[PDB]
């Protein structure tokens, strides 16, 4: 699709068999989701933004469908304000900015 | 133009009498610029990021050119590590997400 920006670009995602809403965020290097269980091993990591840093769990090579497009990549899990899809996955689904 | 998301989507903006690099940020409701001593009346505001809130100065009706496209709107100034173009201005320049 083509998505305009008068509202937050929230989309439905599927991950670990579960549906969630997430924010398409071209200002995020990485993908960060709200606290949840994901299968497999994770590594503790920290990520920063406005307001400073938070602790997250890094899961690698995690499948996620964003709209109906398939991605498999790094998903961080922690106390993000909102589910965020970052560039690492936006690139995988072929997402660009256009003006 | 079309901007790919392999790297941070940074572009040149012109605000007041300055050119700056700024991040085209679909994950930002508002536009937030690194500290600079802009003239004009302002109102205090607090904006939230992944790590918590920060204090900023809200300037209204500020002309700003983004990659040659003229816009005018609310610009927030404060201790952000990166200049951030938010949805408030991305809409004015006809910016979409596409995949």
């Amino acid at each position: 699709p083509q998505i305009t920006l008068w509202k937050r670009p929230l989309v439905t995602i599927r991950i670990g068999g579960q549906l969630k809403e997430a924010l398409l965020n071209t200002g995020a290097d990485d993908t960060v989701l709200e606290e949840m269980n994901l299968p497999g091993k994770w590594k503790p990591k920290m990520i920063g933004g406005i307001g400073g840093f938070i602790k997250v769990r890094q899961y690698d090579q995690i499948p996620i469908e964003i709209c109906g497009h398939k991605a498999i990549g790094t998903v961080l899990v922690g106390p993000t304000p909102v589910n965020i899809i970052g560039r690492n996955l936006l690139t995988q689904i072929g997402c660009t900015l256009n003006f | 133009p079309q901007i790919t998301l392999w790297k941070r989507p940074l572009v040149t903006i012109r605000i007041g009498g300055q050119l700056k690099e700024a991040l085209l940020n679909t994950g930002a409701d508002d536009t937030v610029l690194e500290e600079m001593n802009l003239p004009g009346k302002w109102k205090p505001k607090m904006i939230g990021g992944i790590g918590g809130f920060i204090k900023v100065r809200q300037y209204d009706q500020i002309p700003i050119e983004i990659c040659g496209h003229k816009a005018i709107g609310t610009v927030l100034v404060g201790p952000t590590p990166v200049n951030i173009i938010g949805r408030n201005l991305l809409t004015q320049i006809g910016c979409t997400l596409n995949f």
Binding site: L23, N25, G27, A28, D29, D30, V32, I47, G48, G49, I50, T80, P81, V82, I84, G86 | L23, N25, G27, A28, D29, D30, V32, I47, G48, G49, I50, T80, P81, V82, I84, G86
Partner: peptide
């Protein structure tokens, strides 16, 4: 790495 979410409230 960095995640520049901005909540305008």
């Amino acid at each position: 790495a960095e995640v520049f979410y901005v909540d305008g409230a």
